[PDB]
Structure 1
Amino acid sequence: CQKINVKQIAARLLPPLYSLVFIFGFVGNMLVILILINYKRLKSMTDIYLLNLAISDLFFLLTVPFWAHYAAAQWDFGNTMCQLLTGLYFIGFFSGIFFIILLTIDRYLAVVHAVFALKARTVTFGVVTSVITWVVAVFASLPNIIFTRSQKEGLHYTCSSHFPYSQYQFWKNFQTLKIVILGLVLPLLVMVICYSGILKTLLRMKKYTCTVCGYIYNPEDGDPDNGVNPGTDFKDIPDDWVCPLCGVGKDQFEEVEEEKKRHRDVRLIFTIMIVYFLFWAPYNIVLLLNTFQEFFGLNNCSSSNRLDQAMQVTETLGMTHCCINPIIYAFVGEEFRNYL
């Protein structure tokens, strides 16, 4: 068996691709950072988390031109930069998802537990949680920065991670589960718990009109005369209940179209999380497949080279995501459109 040489392809394909993701990302993110302070004026907890999410992206973007040069030639920046850039990449990766989860839990706290929302959703506490988030991200990145060095291999310089020989398999497995759990498994649980909890709180809030007379059932008012307590969802009401005006069943009732512009905050943060999974989930799956190829997949010569190739391709897609977040704000968020 023998591995494949991708240097010839990558030295042609990666430098113009990376440079453009950089141009479009640096410009895109700086526009976001500026508009959040100079127009939006950081009024809520969302504004603090979205700001830090754009900083984590810029941190990721700062490393991009260095990767473009390394792909095209070699590592001409030394050891200091090698660790410092792999650092900003990891710190930028972890804090990025960490702030998306904090933007998810935030919407779960605003929709559900509305009484606790107004009580504990300050700008000062938002900054405090943000300081501790950037710290946790650093500690998560820390082992990966340490085992990264820039070494000369024959006539070429490299900037890669080299785990300790004696415990090579343990660090390979431990770092795989740390990236996969904190980047896919953990936020995926948060996306399931929160958004199903938000949707069930939203659903209760919907108003239903009688298609016969026009009676609008408000959940907040209910129907005490017939025995329907206030707050109760229309769907949750027994079928035997009739219209308090004409006397028709729940079947001859339709959903009132909603101006989901309150829920525009929920609709945007949902797109940030969903689109994060289109760029980062393919890499996270392949990472688990490549590390656990023996006893959990195909360990053969051909399949291993295919897995390593798929890992580079899917980490290239994941990297591209740092320039994608402004496009979501430009389309989903009506506020960003109003600035132009």
Structure 2
Amino acid sequence: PCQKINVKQIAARLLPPLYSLVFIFGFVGNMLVILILINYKRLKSMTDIYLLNLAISDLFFLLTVPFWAHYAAAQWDFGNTMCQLLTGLYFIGFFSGIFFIILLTIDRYLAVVHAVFALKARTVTFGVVTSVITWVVAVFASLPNIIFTRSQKEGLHYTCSSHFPYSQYQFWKNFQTLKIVILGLVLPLLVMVICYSGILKTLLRMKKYTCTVCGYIYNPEDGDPDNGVNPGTDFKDIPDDWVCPLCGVGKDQFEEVEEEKKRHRDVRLIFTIMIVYFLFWAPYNIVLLLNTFQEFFGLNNCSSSNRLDQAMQVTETLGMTHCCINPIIYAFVGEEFRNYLLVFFQ
């Protein structure tokens, strides 16, 4: 490419304190989640198995962060095996992380959309069996990347980087780009759209409504058959000529009842987890897509080559930072996690 700017002198001063902070806050955060799930929650649910495995893949990702900090500040002083091992934990940590967020979304889809089936399908052992396969798939998805990585001496300094075979370089840039973009953005986004379409459809058709005038409660499960409303009818699907079976007021005098079912309330946490993941990682996937491909489809200039390379460094740093965010989410969005802390203190 073009004669890029030396940001290595800046990165040596800026990245080590940042990475040290992320590591401390993340290690403390994910260790707390793990001990709270294994000792207070005791892993009695399928959800608890996936939440534990999600914390473990964040910890795997975290263990690498102190090594990248030293490398930034000095050089690669850890040797070749360490370079492949840590690159390995970074890719494995990443892929398994998004795989456990997908499993948590499908786990919720079953409990909410196929409720009676989920009673027999959502078991702890199935959660453990599916966790093992997930880890194996993540290891195999990360394998080409571990093989291309090595430690080498470039003049006087030691490096730890990925080296694609030349006269095949564009093929591997293209292949490794589409692998991260499909598995880290296209796959979770497709899961999200399909699963939350079904979840939202169930949540809405089971929504209870109450009359603000007489206090009558409409339950879609019962309907109002004496007024020609069949059991199983969503309140929003009732024609506007229907009136309250008690006081006789219109549909406009009705208000939504707050969610009572714990399985329906649990949708808020898992949806927040997936949406926060996209805020931290979608910027990287889009910059990665632009830097590899759209470099020909859009900007090929020397100035844009440097701008897109610096943007790749910033967005990957933002993504890395995500390994310390889920514990914050559980503390504020998770009902059980905040209730435990209230008893533990008092």
The percent identity for this pair of structures is: 100
SS in 2 for 1:294: helix
Specify whether residues 314 and 243 from structure 1 end up closer, same or farther in structure 2 by C-alpha distance, changes over 3 A only.
same
Contact 1:95 1:133 in 2 (8 A): yes
Q: By how many angstroms is 1:257 displaced?
A: 3.4
Count how many residue pairs are aligned between Structure 1 and Structure 2: 339
Deviations 1:292-336 (A, max 9, x none): 133321010000100000000000010000011111111111222
What residue is the counterpart of 1:295 in the other structure? 296
Return 203-212 or 265-274, whichever deviates more. 203-212
SS in 2 for 1:158: strand
Return 257-266 or 105-114, whichever deviates more. 257-266
Contact 1:110 1:117 in 2 (8 A): yes
Q: By how many angstroms is 1:226 displaced?
A: 2.1
Return 36-45 or 233-242, whichever deviates more. 233-242
Specify whether residues 71 and 303 from structure 1 end up closer, same or farther in structure 2 by C-alpha distance, changes over 3 A only.
same
What residue is the counterpart of 1:305 in the other structure? 306
Deviations 1:76-128 (A, max 9, x none): 11110100000000000000000000000110111001111101011001000
What residue is the counterpart of 2:343 in the other structure? none
SS in 1 for 2:161: strand
Q: By how many angstroms is 1:186 displaced?
A: 0.9
Tell me, in whole angstroms, the C-alpha distance in 2 between the residues paired with 1:117 and 1:261. Answer: 14
SS in 2 for 1:150: strand
Tell me, in whole angstroms, the C-alpha distance in 1 between the residues paired with 2:187 and 2:225. Answer: 43
Tell me, in whole angstroms, the C-alpha distance in 1 between the residues paired with 2:111 and 2:313. Answer: 39
SS in 2 for 1:118: helix
Q: By how many angstroms is 1:151 displaced?
A: 1.0
Contact 1:209 1:253 in 2 (8 A): yes
Contact 2:259 2:265 in 1 (8 A): no
SS in 2 for 1:152: strand
Return 246-255 or 289-298, whichever deviates more. 246-255
User: TM-score by structure 2 length?
Assistant: 0.95
Specify whether residues 328 and 252 from structure 1 end up closer, same or farther in structure 2 by C-alpha distance, changes over 3 A only.
same
Q: By how many angstroms is 1:258 displaced?
A: 3.6
Deviations 1:184-215 (A, max 9, x none): 11101111111121111111121112233332
Specify whether residues 211 and 338 from structure 1 end up closer, same or farther in structure 2 by C-alpha distance, changes over 3 A only.
closer
Contact 2:64 2:90 in 1 (8 A): yes
Tell me, in whole angstroms, the C-alpha distance in 2 between the residues paired with 1:13 and 1:261. Answer: 45
Q: By how many angstroms is 1:240 displaced?
A: 2.5
SS in 2 for 1:89: helix
What residue is the counterpart of 2:252 in the other structure? 251
Contact 1:264 1:333 in 2 (8 A): no
Q: By how many angstroms is 1:236 displaced?
A: 1.2
Deviations 1:199-257 (A, max 9, x none): 11111121112233332111111111222221210011222222222333322322223
Q: By how many angstroms is 1:29 displaced?
A: 0.6
SS in 2 for 1:149: strand
Q: By how many angstroms is 1:261 displaced?
A: 5.0
Contact 1:36 1:42 in 2 (8 A): yes
Contact 1:94 1:182 in 2 (8 A): yes
Return 319-328 or 215-224, whichever deviates more. 215-224
